């Protein structure tokens, strides 16, 4: 009578896994995206006397840090980081976040943004002089040349804050930015200092890293697992009916 609940848990968590996979596939064109991993954990129910019932719980263990494919766009402000490297932005709630989106934009007032989040440089958010032409070097250095003014007047303005962090040290926040895990925060500090060993390429944008093969295989597996759980539910549903209706 309670195997129906085990099968129902399996089917519901299969639905959750399918939702995760569909959300990953919907962002196949999202610039600088990290796919969410999925794994079904098994929870064994304790008790007496013969432990037979073990339930299923869907989980998302971090994300995927494999870089995607770089689109070469003839623009100086689109940048791509090294493998396992992160650009730093000031998060929505005045905090710090890390990302791979190298689509740096400028405003009328001259401040650099990523998805609207100001970029954080050595001494707090980077601000470029109003209406200047900007070039980004291979180590984060930013040069600004005013339009029409001796090209001998090009001078650096600041340096981007580029950090290095692996998947174990990084957890996705609800606003799409990545942050440090508590166990990583305890060791590497609240704020990560700039890592000078990371090279950055200017003029190339990093796309998403969702793998179509894994997504399609996962969808097929989810469908088949759901059908098996429905069969288990149906088998349990007939037996209980007969039993009660007759042994009364």
């Amino acid at each position: 009578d309670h195997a129906i609940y085990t099968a129902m848990g399996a089917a519901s968590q299969t639905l959750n896994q399918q939702a995760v996979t569909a959300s990953n596939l919907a962002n196949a064109s999202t610039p600088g995206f990290r796919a969410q991993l999925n794994a079904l954990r098994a929870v064994p129910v304790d008790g007496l006397s013969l432990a037979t019932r073990t339930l299923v719980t869907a989980s998302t263990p971090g994300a995927d840090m494999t870089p995607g494919q770089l689109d070469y766009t003839s623009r100086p402000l689109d940048v791509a980081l090294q493998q396992d490297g992160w650009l730093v932005v000031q998060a929505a709630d005045g905090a710090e976040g890390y990302t791979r989106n190298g689509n740096i934009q400028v405003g009328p007032t001259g401040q650099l943004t990523i998805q609207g989040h100001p970029v954080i440089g050595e001494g707090g958010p980077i601000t470029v002089p109003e209406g200047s032409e900007i070039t980004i070097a291979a180590d984060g250095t930013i040069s600004a040349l005013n339009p029409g003014d001796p090209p001998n007047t090009v001078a650096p303005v600041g340096r981007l804050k580029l950090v290095k962090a692996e998947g174990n040290e990084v957890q996705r926040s609800d606003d799409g930015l990545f942050r440090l895990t508590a166990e990583a925060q305890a060791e590497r500090g609240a704020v990560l200092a700039a890592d000078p060993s990371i090279r950055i390429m200017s003029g190339v944008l990093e796309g998403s890293n969702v793998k179509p093969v894994e997504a399609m295989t996962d969808m097929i597996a989810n469908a088949r697992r759901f059908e098996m759980q429905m069969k288990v539910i149906t088998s349990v549903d007939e037996n209980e009916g007969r039993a009660n209706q007759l042994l009364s």
């Binding site: 129906i4 519901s12 539910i233 549903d237 009916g241 009364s248």
Partner: protein, 67 residues
């Protein structure tokens, strides 16, 4: 009691009902759970009906104790 689950967020900032960022809130109903609950309730209901039927039969037989 209200079920404890995150409200299902849907991005439709064209519908007249919306949020500040166009996040329409939809109920957190888990369809599989509700179908299984309906089946379980029906089965438990039928079991209780059988209990009542056999109990009434026994009461009649007890009323026919010595006769």
């Amino acid at each position: 009691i209200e079920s404890q689950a995150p409200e299902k967020l849907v991005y439709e900032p064209g519908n007249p009902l919306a949020d500040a960022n166009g996040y329409v809130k939809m109920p957190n109903v888990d369809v599989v759970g509700e179908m299984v609950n309906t089946m379980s309730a029906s089965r438990s209901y039928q079991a209780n009906i059988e209990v009542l039927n056999t109990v009434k039969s026994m009461m009649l037989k007890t009323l026919t104790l010595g006769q």
